[PDB]
């Protein structure tokens, strides 16, 4: 399970898989904590 905010994406461009967070509006590509 996901810290508070996160939820797993999908690139529509490149099919991978990466993480953004509804509080902070960060993303990245590695599983947050």
């Given at each position: 399970?996901?810290?508070?905010?996160?939820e797993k994406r999908m690139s529509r461009?490149?099919?991978?898989?990466?993480?953004?967070?509804?509080?902070?509006?960060?993303?990245?590509?590695?599983?947050?904590?």
């Amino acid at each position: 399970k996901l810290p508070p905010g996160w939820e797993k994406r999908m690139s529509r461009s490149s099919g991978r898989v990466y993480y953004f967070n509804h509080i902070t509006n960060a993303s990245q590509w590695e599983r947050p904590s």
